[PDB]
Amino acid sequence: QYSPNTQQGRTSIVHLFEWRWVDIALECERYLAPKGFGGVQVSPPNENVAIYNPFRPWWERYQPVSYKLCTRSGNEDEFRNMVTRCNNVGVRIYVDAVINHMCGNAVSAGTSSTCGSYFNPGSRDFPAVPYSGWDFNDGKCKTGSGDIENYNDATQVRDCRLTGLLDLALEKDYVRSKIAEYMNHLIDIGVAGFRLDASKHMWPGDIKAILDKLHNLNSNWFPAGSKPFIYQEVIDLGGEPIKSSDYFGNGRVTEFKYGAKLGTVIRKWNGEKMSYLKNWGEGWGFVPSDRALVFVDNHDNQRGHGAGGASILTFWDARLYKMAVGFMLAHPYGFTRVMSSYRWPRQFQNGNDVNDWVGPPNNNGVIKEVTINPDTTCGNDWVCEHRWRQIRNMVIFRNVVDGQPFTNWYDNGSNQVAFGRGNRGFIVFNNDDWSFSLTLQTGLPAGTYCDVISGDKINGNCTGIKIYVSDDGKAHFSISNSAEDPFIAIHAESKL
Numbered sequence: 033q034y035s036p037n038t039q040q041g042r043t044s045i046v047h048l049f050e051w052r053w054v055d056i057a058l059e060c061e062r063y064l065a066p067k068g069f070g071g072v073q074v075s076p077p078n079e080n081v082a083i084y085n086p087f088r089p090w091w092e093r094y095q096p097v098s099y100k101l102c103t104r105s106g107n108e109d110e111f112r113n114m115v116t117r118c119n120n121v122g123v124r125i126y127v128d129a130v131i132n133h134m135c136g137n138a139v140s141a142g143t144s145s146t147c148g149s150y151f152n153p154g155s156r157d158f159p160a161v162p163y164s165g166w167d168f169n170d171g172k173c174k175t176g177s178g179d180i181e182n183y184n185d186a187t188q189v190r191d192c193r194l195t196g197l198l199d200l201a202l203e204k205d206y207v208r209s210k211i212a213e214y215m216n217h218l219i220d221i222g223v224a225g226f227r228l229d230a231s232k233h234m235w236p237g238d239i240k241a242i243l244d245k246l247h248n249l250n251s252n253w254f255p256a257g258s259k260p261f262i263y264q265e266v267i268d269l270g271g272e273p274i275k276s277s278d279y280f281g282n283g284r285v286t287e288f289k290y291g292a293k294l295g296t297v298i299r300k301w302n303g304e305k306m307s308y309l310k311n312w313g314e315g316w317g318f319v320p321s322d323r324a325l326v327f328v329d330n331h332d333n334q335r336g337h338g339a340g341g342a343s344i345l346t347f348w349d350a351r352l353y354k355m356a357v358g359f360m361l362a363h364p365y366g367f368t369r370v371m372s373s374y375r376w377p378r379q380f381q382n383g384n385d386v387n388d389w390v391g392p393p394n395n396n397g398v399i400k401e402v403t404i405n406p407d408t409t410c411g412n413d414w415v416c417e418h419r420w421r422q423i424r425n426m427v428i429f430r431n432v433v434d435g436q437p438f439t440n441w442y443d444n445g446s447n448q449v450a451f452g453r454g455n456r457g458f459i460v461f462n463n464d465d466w467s468f469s470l471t472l473q474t475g476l477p478a479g480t481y482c483d484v485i486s487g488d489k490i491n492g493n494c495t496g497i498k499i500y501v502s503d504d505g506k507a508h509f510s511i512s513n514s515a516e517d518p519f520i521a522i523h524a525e526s527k528l
């Protein structure tokens with residue numbers, strides 16, 4: 033469950049947050065495939081409750097009503113079509129599996145669901161599955177409120193309601209079977225793996241029990257005996273009875289300390305500086321590289337939800353964000369996930385964004401199509417960070433240097449650092465308040481290389497900065513502290 037199952041030489045996956053299936057299918061063919069993206073993490077494909085107050089928030093999708101593949105992103109056929117077209121071009125699909133709970137115990141009963149299925153939170157009747165009162169942890173939870181009140185209590189974290197969401201009795205074979213049934217339907221359609229939502233709130237053993245019931249990946253696209261890639265969402269900063277290591281047996285785990293610490297460093301807060309990244313990785317107390325799924329920001333924390341806090345870098349802090357994402361993609365630690373967002377009317381009141389609930393771009397609840405502008409950027413309020421030249425080219429940088437060791441590290445003792453990856457790539461950063469201008473050892477073969485951050489190598493020339501590597505691998509780099517992008521990256525495939 034540790035291998036992502038991506039095509040050889042594809043090292044990253046993108047979270048196309050809240051996108052429609054039909055748009056993801058097109059994106060796979062027109063962009064993801066040709067630009068070397070390994071895969072896509074899609075929003076929960078199963079039916080959820082339609083919440084009208086506030087108006088269709090992004091978070092209604094983490095409140096299941098049934099396992100019917102019918103959401104605002106599309107119906108079953110559209111989902112199947114997407115998986116097929118994507119797989120046919122070598123881009124994998126990873127499904128966000130919401131299996132720890134159903135909806136909020138306080139939502140009104142009826143048919144306010146994306147597929148019209150009837151549900152009754154009050155009586156715990158989810159007839160579409162079906163689940164009944166006998167399938168929840170109500171009798172297990174021992175908190176007054178029936179909700180998680182103490183995170184220092186591991187049993188509470190697992191048997192009580194997270195924020196009031198109806199907690200499933202995952203120790204029951206019937207429940208395990210229903211979930212495995214849903215997951216197997218997805219596996220057969222062709223999905224390569226899953227993001228297990230709220231894994232901290234489930235016992236490692238129940239997760240194991242469900243995984244034992246899964247089929248191998250679809251043999252039309254994957255080698256026989258292929259197991260789905262599993263990455264579990266466990267928010268594990270220090271200080272909790274539940275450790276992320278408790279989940280290594282089931283697959284990889286989200287390393288939330290990664291983006292939290294990288295943000296503090298790039299923002300130069302808490303006395304942190306880029307020269308301290310010389311031993312980045314496990315040296316920073318992170319999980320083994322072979323069990324990590326890393327990212328700068330995710331859908332929850334780029335909003336204030338989840339964990340990370342103010343240090344988290346987002347598309348809103350574009351300049352520092354491109355640098356952080358670039359550092360992530362150049363560094364060999366972990367398996368990288370890139371984020372792709374939509375803009376919302378962020379409105380802070382007392383340090384809180386009162387509009388943090390705002391869902392994807394829509395016309396009376398109907399998600400707007402992703403439009404592509406003449407310059408390849410997206411329209412209709414979709415950010416498309418994955419299309420930003422500096423990010424997409426770094427996604428390619430990672431593919432090119434895959435397998436090469438971290439070498440030729442340089443630092444000025446402050447915020448000017450550089451490092452290479454074998455003889456295949458070299459990157460330089462200037463996050464100090466003065467200009468960088470130095471001749472460095474790159475470990476690369478002599479030649480003219482196009483800087484992939486300022487431009488592209490197009491038909492024998494570069495559209496941006498050109499770097500000249502001498503016979504001894506030395507190259508001069510100049511970066512003004514006032515540069516749009518204070519970092520340069522060159523690799524084996526950007527060489528003229």
Ligand SMILES: C[C@H]1O[C@H](O[C@H]2[C@H](O)[C@@H](O)[C@@H](O[C@@H]3C(CO)=C[C@H](N[C@H]4[C@H](O)[C@@H](O)[C@@H](O[C@H]5[C@H](O)[C@@H](O)[C@H](O)O[C@@H]5CO)O[C@@H]4C)[C@H](O)[C@H]3O)O[C@@H]2CO)[C@H](O)[C@@H](O)[C@@H]1O
Binds near residue numbers: 331
């Ligand atoms: C009934 C309630 O419905 C709505 O709740 C929504 C949340 O507001 C929203 O974040 C979104 O969240 C998703 C869910 C739910 O499926 C789980 C994931 N992230 C979780 C994480 O798994 C949890 O562990 C937790 O994290 C804790 C850490 O564990 C803890 O260590 C740290 O210190 O604190 C955090 C919490 O601050 O919460 C994370 C968000 C998914 O990734 C995430 O997308 O969906 C729910 C459901 O709609 C509504 O907003 C509430 O008001 C209602 O009470």
Ligand SMILES: [Ca+2]
Binds near residue numbers: 189190199233
């Ligand atoms: Ca649980």
Ligand SMILES: [Cl-]
Binds near residue numbers: 265286330
């Ligand atoms: Cl995540």
